Design an enzyme around this catalytic site. Structure first.
Site, PDB file in Angstrom:
ATOM      1  N   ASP A  42       2.147  -5.229  -5.030  1.00 11.16           N
ATOM      2  CA  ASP A  42       2.081  -4.009  -5.230  1.00 11.16           C
ATOM      3  C   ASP A  42       3.300  -3.327  -5.231  1.00 11.16           C
ATOM      4  O   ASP A  42       4.327  -2.765  -4.317  1.00 11.16           O
ATOM      5  CB  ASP A  42       1.514  -3.638  -3.213  1.00 11.16           C
ATOM      6  CG  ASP A  42       1.662  -2.328  -3.498  1.00 11.16           C
ATOM      7  OD1 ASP A  42       1.761  -1.275  -3.960  1.00 11.16           O
ATOM      8  OD2 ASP A  42       0.775  -2.648  -1.994  1.00 11.16           O
ATOM      9  N   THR A  43       3.124  -2.502  -6.744  1.00  3.10           N
ATOM     10  CA  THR A  43       4.455  -2.382  -6.969  1.00  3.10           C
ATOM     11  C   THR A  43       5.147  -0.792  -6.456  1.00  3.10           C
ATOM     12  O   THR A  43       5.624  -0.090  -6.077  1.00  3.10           O
ATOM     13  CB  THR A  43       4.685  -1.351  -8.539  1.00  3.10           C
ATOM     14  OG1 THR A  43       3.770  -0.624  -8.884  1.00  3.10           O
ATOM     15  CG2 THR A  43       4.661  -2.639  -9.542  1.00  3.10           C
ATOM     16  N   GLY A  44       3.933  -0.146  -5.701  1.00  2.38           N
ATOM     17  CA  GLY A  44       3.368   1.316  -4.592  1.00  2.38           C
ATOM     18  C   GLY A  44       4.360   0.723  -3.236  1.00  2.38           C
ATOM     19  O   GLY A  44       4.500   1.853  -2.647  1.00  2.38           O
TER      20      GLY A  44
HETATM   21  C1  LIG Z   1      -2.084  -0.414   0.881  1.00  3.29           C
HETATM   22  C2  LIG Z   1      -2.177  -0.811  -0.738  1.00  3.29           C
HETATM   23  C3  LIG Z   1      -3.182  -1.923  -0.930  1.00  3.29           C
HETATM   24  C4  LIG Z   1      -3.518   0.131  -1.042  1.00  3.29           C
HETATM   25  N1  LIG Z   1      -2.391   1.677  -1.263  1.00  3.29           N
HETATM   26  C5  LIG Z   1      -1.493   1.642  -2.146  1.00  3.29           C
HETATM   27  C6  LIG Z   1       0.483   1.453  -1.596  1.00  3.29           C
HETATM   28  O1  LIG Z   1       0.918   1.254  -2.873  1.00  3.29           O
HETATM   29  C7  LIG Z   1       0.334   2.169  -0.854  1.00  3.29           C
HETATM   30  C8  LIG Z   1       1.291   3.868  -1.770  1.00  3.29           C
HETATM   31  C9  LIG Z   1       1.581   4.387  -1.104  1.00  3.29           C
HETATM   32  C10 LIG Z   1       3.290   4.937  -0.936  1.00  3.29           C
HETATM   33  C11 LIG Z   1       4.050   5.650  -0.103  1.00  3.29           C
HETATM   34  C12 LIG Z   1       2.723   6.645   0.676  1.00  3.29           C
HETATM   35  C13 LIG Z   1       1.614   6.447   0.614  1.00  3.29           C
HETATM   36  C14 LIG Z   1       1.328   5.290   0.126  1.00  3.29           C
HETATM   37  N2  LIG Z   1       1.859   2.204  -0.298  1.00  3.29           N
HETATM   38  C15 LIG Z   1       2.067   1.413   0.855  1.00  3.29           C
HETATM   39  O2  LIG Z   1       1.561   1.480   1.751  1.00  3.29           O
HETATM   40  C16 LIG Z   1       4.013   1.732   1.581  1.00  3.29           C
HETATM   41  C17 LIG Z   1       4.640   2.581   1.174  1.00  3.29           C
HETATM   42  C18 LIG Z   1       5.925   2.133   1.329  1.00  3.29           C
HETATM   43  C19 LIG Z   1       6.319   1.261   2.428  1.00  3.29           C
HETATM   44  C20 LIG Z   1       5.700   0.839   2.717  1.00  3.29           C
HETATM   45  O3  LIG Z   1       5.771  -0.832   3.491  1.00  3.29           O
HETATM   46  C21 LIG Z   1       4.209   0.770   2.035  1.00  3.29           C
HETATM   47  S1  LIG Z   1      -2.737   3.101  -0.394  1.00  3.29           S
HETATM   48  O4  LIG Z   1      -2.182   4.194  -1.067  1.00  3.29           O
HETATM   49  O5  LIG Z   1      -3.209   2.683   0.569  1.00  3.29           O
HETATM   50  C22 LIG Z   1      -4.170   3.364  -2.084  1.00  3.29           C
HETATM   51  C23 LIG Z   1      -3.757   4.065  -3.173  1.00  3.29           C
HETATM   52  C24 LIG Z   1      -5.197   3.887  -3.741  1.00  3.29           C
HETATM   53  C25 LIG Z   1      -5.608   3.174  -2.574  1.00  3.29           C
HETATM   54  C26 LIG Z   1      -7.437   3.500  -3.242  1.00  3.29           C
HETATM   55  C27 LIG Z   1      -8.820   2.660  -2.425  1.00  3.29           C
HETATM   56  C28 LIG Z   1     -10.016   2.764  -3.340  1.00  3.29           C
HETATM   57  N3  LIG Z   1      -9.841   3.597  -4.273  1.00  3.29           N
HETATM   58  O6  LIG Z   1      -7.997   3.939  -3.969  1.00  3.29           O
HETATM   59  S2  LIG Z   1      -6.081   3.423  -1.130  1.00  3.29           S
END
Ligand SMILES: CC(C)CN(C[C@@H](O)[C@H](Cc1ccccc1)NC(=O)c1cccc(O)c1)S(=O)(=O)c1ccc(-c2ccno2)s1
Lengths: 99, 99
Positions: B25-27
């Site tokens: 997870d690069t995000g």
């Molecule tokens: C959780 C993951 C399975 C899905 N998400 C993408 C993550 O990379 C998320 C990105 C992030 C960064 C900063 C703030 C908020 C979010 N990172 C994080 O949650 C994060 C950020 C920084 C520190 C940390 O400990 C965690 S996510 O953001 O929850 C997500 C994106 C697209 C999704 C989807 C579901 C259906 N279609 O599309 S679900």
């Protein structure tokens, strides 16, 4: 290009007349952009991650330029804290993970 | 390896003699695993994702083998929707984004 991960992988994207910084996010199934009033039809959706769910608007076939690469596909618009380029568009610009 | 993104980049990790599936997870700044037992001291931490903030347990200097590549670093344990390997360990295994 090659992007290392010492810092957040933020890149410039263009959606119409807006340039924004967005995260290249391999953990995101779809692209999620900060609130913006895009033209056209959309559908309501809930997406979940750390902390729970947010409500978003799903727009289809939206063109977005990512580092000069052309993409077109689904964009979810809602109250995300960061613009997120997900796998749906990462594949279109040729993005892979390598180690 | 090279990993494309038409599917979720799920890989097998080894932690504490246990095999788990985790998302590259690069995000994600941090590595966050679903509820599990890990030995040693930990400290309470809060982290934020797309849906808000959660409480996690922070364990430092934990070995994880990620698809055969060794890392030793910080692992957060808490109510993440899926096991995620974040940039803190992706950097250790030499993972980059390429397009
Ligand atoms: C959780 C993951 C399975 C899905 N998400 C993408 C993550 O990379 C998320 C990105 C992030 C960064 C900063 C703030 C908020 C979010 N990172 C994080 O949650 C994060 C950020 C920084 C520190 C940390 O400990 C965690 S996510 O953001 O929850 C997500 C994106 C697209 C999704 C989807 C579901 C259906 N279609 O599309 S679900």
């Amino acid at each position: 290009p090659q992007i290392t991960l010492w810092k957040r992988p933020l890149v410039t994207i263009r959606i119409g007349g807006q340039l924004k910084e967005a995260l290249l996010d391999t953990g995101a199934d779809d692209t999620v952009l900060e609130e913006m009033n895009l033209p056209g039809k959309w559908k309501p959706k809930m997406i979940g991650g750390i902390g729970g769910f947010i409500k978003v608007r799903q727009y289809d076939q939206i063109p977005i330029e990512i580092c000069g690469h052309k993409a077109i596909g689904t964009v979810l618009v809602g109250p995300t804290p960061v613009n997120i380029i997900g796998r749906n568009l990462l594949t279109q610009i040729g993005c892979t993970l390598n180690f």
